[PDB]
Subunit: 454 residues, 2 copies
């Protein structure tokens, strides 16, 4: 009787917990935080993993395994045993091997990636990270933007979660990198931004510290231009929060463990159900026939609705007589009495329509969750409406810290509560000439998306 009792707009954290637990997605035990990823979510992880892996195989990225863990001048001209102690990161492990392997320009580009594995689930796990080294900065930037587009496709085309491409501020970018691109998603229930995925342009900063030098065509020793990117299982959690409802989970059909479940209504109907399942499995459709004995049909309805199957198929005596089956979708309560012959094509059409509907509704909520302001006195109401803000900014690093401190102090009205830079979006609205910064008053530079975040 796994039935979600908490309401999504009321008790959001308890709703998330009940949704991820009751749907047989994860399983806790007594120690704090640790959980087990049951197949219901690991199938989604696999699907997105296969997508990203094939797409980076096309780009020439090769997978590998490095033994990874669990300031300017000194870290750089110090030996590797001390470099590991100072910064025990994946860069300190990988980039010495990069310096050993890279010697000639014909050794570039070097593209490596690894899928690694080692509170609240799916927020703070499995992930992937990749590192590249190129001969020029233009090639590095091209690869960074390609990976960011791959992340946009990961979130929007697979999980139906709309993300905003942008550039991180000087305070939120990678510490040693030159520039950091990102994609951002929005959770309306708490009105908070979240970093969906990240992609960094490291440049020659790390090549300086590890002496990752190469000889070009003219025989000149030049530094490589490195990039690094990564994406975690957070994509699952976001995908859980943007589509679920009070009934439970709603999983987009492109990543569903089982896309359509066939429920009998209670002799020959079981054979006809198996025939329909064999017919549907041929057309790429993932089918599971829930032929439980004692469980009532409504119990199975609630079970598969909590699990979040996009479509469920009912076949009863009247359905067997009139020649049609009763399919019902999960995002909305729309039902369809459809013939057995036209089952597979119209079912996959319904699946694509459900995916597009989920993405479009999430994009509409995203657009409704952003307020384009101009002066600072609008930030506190906009934040109190569970919304993000898009304001003109001069991109002064001190101003960001000042705004965060003041917005945290302006939390008199009873995680955190401060407002930080989500990103400087690539899609920049037009900036009038004399436009001033929304906080300092200096000449503004670009439109920056701010808001509360995870």
């Amino acid at each position: 009787g796994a039935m979600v009792t908490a309401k999504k707009d009321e008790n959001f954290s308890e709703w998330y917990t009940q949704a991820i637990v009751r749907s047989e997605m994860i399983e806790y035990y007594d120690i704090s935080g640790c959980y087990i990823m049951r197949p219901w979510a690991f199938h989604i992880w696999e699907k997105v993993q296969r997508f990203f892996d094939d797409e980076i195989k096309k780009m020439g990225v090769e997978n590998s395994y490095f033994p990874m863990f669990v300031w300017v001048t000194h870290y750089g001209d110090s030996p590797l045993p001390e470099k590991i102690a100072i910064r025990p990161t994946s860069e300190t492990i990988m980039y010495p091997a990069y310096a050993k392997w890279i010697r000639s320009h014909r050794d570039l580009p070097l593209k490596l990636n690894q899928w690694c594995s080692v509170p609240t689930p799916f927020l703070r796990f499995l992930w992937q990270e990749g590192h590249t080294a190129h001969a020029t900065e233009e090639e590095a930037w091209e690869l960074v933007l390609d990976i960011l587009e791959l992340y946009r496709r990961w979130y929007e085309e697979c999980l139906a979660v709309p993300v905003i491409k942008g550039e991180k501020s000087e305070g939120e970018k990678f510490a040693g990198g030159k520039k950091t691109t990102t994609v951002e998603a929005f959770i309306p229930e708490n009105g908070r931004g979240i970093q969906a995925a990240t992609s960094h342009l490291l440049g020659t900063n790390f090549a300086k510290m590890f002496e990752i030098e190469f000889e070009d065509e003219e025989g000149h020793k030049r530094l490589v231009h490195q990039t690094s990117w990564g994406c975690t299982t957070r994509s699952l959690g976001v995908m859980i929060m943007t589509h679920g409802d009070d009934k439970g989970l709603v999983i987009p059909p492109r990543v569903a463990s089982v896309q359509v479940v066939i429920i009998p209504i209670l002799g020959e109907i079981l054979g006809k159900c198996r025939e329909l399942k064999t017919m549907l499995e041929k057309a790429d459709i993932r089918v599971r026939i829930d032929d439980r004995s004692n469980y009532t049909p409504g119990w199975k309805y609630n079970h598969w609705e909590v699990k979040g199957v996009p479509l469920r198929l009912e076949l009863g005596p009247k359905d067997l007589a009139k020649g049609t089956a009763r399919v019902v979708r999960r995002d909305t309560g729309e039902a369809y009495q459809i013939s057995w012959a036209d089952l597979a094509p119209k079912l996959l059409e319904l699946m694509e329509g459900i995916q597009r509907s989920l993405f479009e509704k999430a994009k509409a909520r995203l657009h409704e969750g952003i307020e384009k302001i101009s002066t600072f006195d609008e930030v506190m109401p906009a934040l109190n409406r569970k919304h993000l803000v898009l304001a003109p900014w001069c991109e002064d690093p001190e101003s960001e810290e000042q705004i965060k401190k003041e917005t945290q102090k302006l939390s008199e009205i009873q995680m955190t509560g401060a407002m930080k830079t989500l990103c400087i979006p690539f899609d920049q609205p037009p900036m009038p000439e004399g436009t001033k910064c929304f906080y300092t008053g200096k000449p503004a530079k670009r439109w920056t998306l701010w808001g509360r975040s995870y």
Copy 2:
């Protein structure tokens, strides 16, 4: 210009180290032995992983992830059973919940062994492990045998390494389970058997231990019949030892990262662009046939350097194209396994190369199978053991399957090993000289009535494969 200098049948350990390092499929990181797995070997691991995963997904096995707070290479780590089987008991409630089939692909790196061997005896490896629970013992045993057949296909159809299916002795099986099946491989250069993969019939012991019960159709609470299996990157190591030669590695074309390497022959600054463009269009043509191709147009190295480089890396086929071959409209394809050269027209390149590839794979398999057949001696009495062991061979003997007799034989063969005091001008890795049961093979040779045990003299039960092991 990294060449493999050690002879494979003279300095086997040095040969293995040179072969894995100079082929750019491994990179040692520090003094402890910690190493990086480079894409040249990770591609083979990805191929075998894709095969096994697609095959077990047809069996209804679903992938999952469990963290960390005989099973082959796992004499370390915090155990998988104590983490999984509590959740298994919490999940399984009725026969409707069965059968349960889970699997996970994992990787680990711990403090390295004393005198380690990467992709073999090492505390750093990638692997997969699966666990199942069934209502009956028959279904569980059938799944065990299906997984063992999948392992046989993993080693033979993918890596071209012949293996022997069998069951472990009472003293060499998973002590917690009921019966432990296995596949065994043979290394002739040191004459040692090795456990390629394992599949266990755990039975109801862990069901009792973790209270994993279920209600049947009538209502009685019964125990589940559990199985578990696993396979590591050790396969790669075996695939390295089985097909490698004095020149370096020989990778079967099915799992090769690069199947055909194109080497344009360019002398002087004349007719270079035409040859390069022709090599590029040939690469595109071959890629249109699902052939993995790569062109080595590096000018700082001569053709001989490239030959040795891609021979050490183990590319099964290389394609030479000079200006004379540009004129004749043909190319010279050299195979890595035997070295035989062929002259093939451009229109025949893709079909003849797909054919050469299959031929090299089958030959790679058949030669190793012949070596395996030649490394096993069928004996009848115990005084035949130490000779056959000194010939770096295994033995197939009739045995009564007495547990204490196996320990007696281990101690006796260790006492009779001798020569444990002369290392000449070439010291290698010293392993134990005792002989133990590798497996009781499924393919049992016929047993004539009245056959006595080769050691105890008691009535012999079955043919058992003994030998020195890893």
